[PDB]
């Protein structure tokens, strides 16, 4: 209604499980609040340059701006933080990309990022972390990290089912838990907030199936289920058992020695994919001490949030970490950092996260060549030490570039 | 009943908030399963040697063995994993120390470590992590880490309130949540496990008060509340607000600029202690990228579990990390690693965690001199590169010692 759909351009189509991408697809993008005003222009420019270079003018993206966050209230009115048509348009055009979003406080509004994922049922949050040679890192061997995270997006504590301490609601569930359920283990029932953590079988098997399928398609070495099941047995422990069960029932997993680890034979390359599990808190140690042991990771919503952030700091990537939210009917690629309002408009932050989520975008569309051109550009600009302030502070011998100029440095290195 | 209380020795006494430690106190110790059979002998010997050296024979601990875990079933019968008298004896003698515990699967038994903390209401899990010069680390600057973790022990998801998917119980709470509470946000209500996360005001203020008091007593620079309150508002977000409120109402905190950070004036040294907060997943990044910015940490049960493990890997300490569980009536010091059954009885693992929790033990008893002798011994043995297999693999020029011999190396360096 306030979005202008491009005169030229065609919708991507879902022809049962498969995308049918035209040569001039329309892609919805949400600019983002804060530094989204700096990073999104940079990404629109390097994606245009890479599809221009790969396909010699034969292909072109017709970018269509849609609204969420603070910019949505300036277009549609002070109270509409998430217009209903953003959800219809992402559904409709199948793939979109977004910058960082501001969720406000004071207004009872929950995370607009979790709202998009739940509302569109984008149950996979895919976070790949690899090291780009030459980025400053706090660890001695960042090059040993190349993992791909499959974090469940629709359930867990992250779903937002919770009640305030002293509310009538919380009082009512606490009464139901103590009286009807007989729980004796709430230490202080008065002035007590209560949160609900759900974990279902369909919820964990649709995520784990995607993780093993990803490992077969890209012949990765292993899928590691990480969970805190020795303490949360019926949610996190259920997730590890349902995960193992799916690798046995649908991928023909077999015990290695006397378990619990399984072997899945990659029907394409013939190699064995170890399916294993590790408790989440020892895993937060293993990624620092033994990162080469791990590769595809499957976990619940909260743990995946912690694992992705911890990994991304290790490979010097807090500002170049890409991410995607994939459901069955559409996909939403995104800058994984926040809006950083201090720097907003100054053209200085790293455009690296949203540029690398755009290469994940291009790859999902089957435009593999344009996507390989962006990572070639990325590795060249970083290797050239022609870098943005966050990388330059930690480097010696680096040239400092603005956000838009690092965009150009990626195109020069293509 | 099967414990032999020492002929010599006197109980420590609680004379309202203060311990009155005799010269020959009786200390309960639980040996632990697995490698507890290797580490506990090493610790009994270096603590004896340090109180012998500090007080020249004037003082002596009368060690009294008590039982939990696998060893308890061999003393009291196959079914008693936690005898009721262990709880009475820890209560009674006030301070105890323990090795690693085996909790069994198949028997519906929840964590024996969480059972001791809940049953004795030891609401503080105190985890100090500092770097000992010369221990191998995966990070470039381990020496910038010196933090003290105050993890809440009695509430959160870690309390164990949960129901199995498809049980009558879970079905009943899911029906109550959808029908009576009107929750529309459980994506898959069928075959769904459910866990409860409680956070109360008394629960978070007794923990945070201990954290600020610790920072005043040891003139630390700051107390950082870490929480995931932007998504769990009424449990994790309640914890940050109740924390800030307590620093204002009881420690006379004042805004720095326009908040939200507070300043507390240390009534003893006159210095200002910054009270601040950071979201838990950006904090998992900040500890790797900016560790010198942080010092006393206060957090809920699960996050403290992750933060302690992540920190302890960074300072090369997965096998030398000390820990304590402190309530108002007693305290239980402990080896923070697991039972490692593979190595059990071979005398090779690092005795470092239980030895450093024994120095925390000695310090709590007011036996400061004996405790300073143990850390002097520790730093000397590590610096001497006269080290155990876990440190030696990662070092060049190290002598490899068995577990008992590293005990002797700590005494030699005293
Ligand atoms: O809001 P936020 O959420 O507070 O993000 C936290 C911090 O990470 C950094 N940051 C966020 N997005 C970034 C990007 N795209 N590139 C580089 N640094 C980024 C900034 O760190 P610094 O302020 O440390 O540069 C920022 O203040
Ligand atoms: O059981 P657990 O729980 O599986 O503990 C995990 C691993 O950490 C190491 N570990 C545990 N306690 C240790 C200690 N006290 N000293 C040194 N390494 C320890 C061993 O690692 P490694 O098997 O890698 O030596 C052990 O297999």
Swiss-Prot record, chains A, B:
Post-translational events: Phosphorylation state of this enzyme is controlled by isocitrate dehydrogenase kinase/phosphatase (AceK).
Binding site for Mg(2+): 305
GO cellular component, one term: cytosol
Keyword Phosphoprotein applies: yes
Keywords assigned by UniProt, alphabetized: Acetylation, Glyoxylate bypass, Magnesium, Manganese, Metal-binding, NADP, Oxidoreductase, Phosphoprotein, Tricarboxylic acid cycle
Catalytic reaction(s) noted: D-threo-isocitrate + NADP(+) = 2-oxoglutarate + CO2 + NADPH
Modified residues (N6-acetyllysine): 140
pH dependence: Optimum pH is 7-9. Exhibits maximum stability at pH 6.
Residues bearing the modification Phosphoserine: 111
E.C. number: 1.1.1.42
Gene Ontology MF term list: guanosine tetraphosphate binding; isocitrate dehydrogenase (NADP+) activity; magnesium ion binding; NAD binding
Effect listed in the UniProt record for changing residue 158 to F: Nearly abolishes enzyme activity. No significant effect on substrate affinity
InterPro entries: IsoCit/isopropylmalate_DH_CS, Isocitrate_DH_NADP_dimer_prok, IsoPropMal-DH-like_dom
Binding annotation for D-threo-isocitrate: 111, 113, 117, 127, 151
Cited PANTHER family: ISOCITRATE DEHYDROGENASE [NADP] (PTHR43504:SF1)
NCBIfam families xrefs: PRK07006.1, prok_nadp_idh
Protein name per the record: Isocitrate dehydrogenase [NADP]
């Amino acid at each position: 209604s306030k979005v202008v759909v491009p005169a030229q351009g065609k919708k991507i189509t879902l022809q049962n499980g498969k995308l049918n991408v035209p040569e001039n697809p329309i892609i919805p993008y949400i600019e983002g609040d804060g530094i989204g005003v700096d990073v999104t222009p940079a990404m629109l420019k390097v994606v245009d340059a890479a599809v221009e270079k790969a396909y010699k003018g034969e292909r072109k993206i017709s970018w269509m701006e849609i609204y969420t966050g603070e910019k949505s209230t300036q277009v549609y009115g002070q109270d509409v933080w998430l217009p209903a048509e953003t959800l219809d348009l992402i559904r409709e055009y199948r793939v979109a990309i977004k910058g960082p979003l501001t969720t406000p406080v004071g207004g009872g509004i929950r995370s607009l990022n979790v709202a998009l994922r739940q509302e569109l049922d984008l149950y996979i949050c895919l976070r790949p972390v690899r090291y780009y040679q030459g980025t400053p890192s706090p660890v001695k061997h960042p090059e040993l990290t190349d993992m791909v995270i499959f974090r469940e997006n629709s359930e867990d504590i992250y779903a937002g089912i919770e009640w305030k301490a002293d509310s009538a609601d919380a009082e009512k569930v606490i009464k139901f838990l103590r009286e009807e359920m007989g729980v004796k283990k709430i230490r202080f029932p008065e002035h007590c907030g209560i949160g609900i953590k759900p974990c279902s079988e369909e919820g964990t098997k649709r995520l784990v199936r995607a993780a093993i399928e990803y490992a077969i398609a890209n012949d990765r070495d292993s899928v590691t289920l990480v969970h805190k099941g020795n303490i949360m047995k019926f949610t996190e422990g259920a997730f590890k058992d349902w995960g193992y069960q799916l690798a046995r029932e649908e991928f023909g997993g077999e015990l290695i020695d006397g378990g619990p680890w399984l072997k899945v034979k990659n029907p394409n390359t013939g190699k064995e994919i170890v399916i294993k599990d590790v408790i989440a808190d020892a895993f937060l140690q293993q990624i620092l001490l033994r990162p080469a042991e791990y590769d595809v990771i499957a976990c619940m919503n909260l743990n995946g949030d912690y694992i992705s952030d911890a990994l991304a700091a290790q490979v010097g990537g807090i500002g170049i970490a890409p991410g995607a939210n994939i459901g069955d009917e559409c996909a939403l690629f995104e800058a994984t950092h926040g809006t950083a309002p201090k720097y907003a408009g100054q053209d200085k932050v790293n455009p690296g996260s949203i540029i690398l989520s755009a290469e994940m975008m291009l790859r999902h569309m089957g435009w593999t060549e344009a996507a390989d051109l962006i990572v070639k550009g990325m590795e060249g600009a970083i290797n050239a030490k022609t870098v943005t302030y966050d990388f330059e502070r930690l480097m010696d011998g680096a040239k400092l570039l603005k956000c838009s100029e690092f965009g150009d440095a990626i195109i020069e290195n293509m």
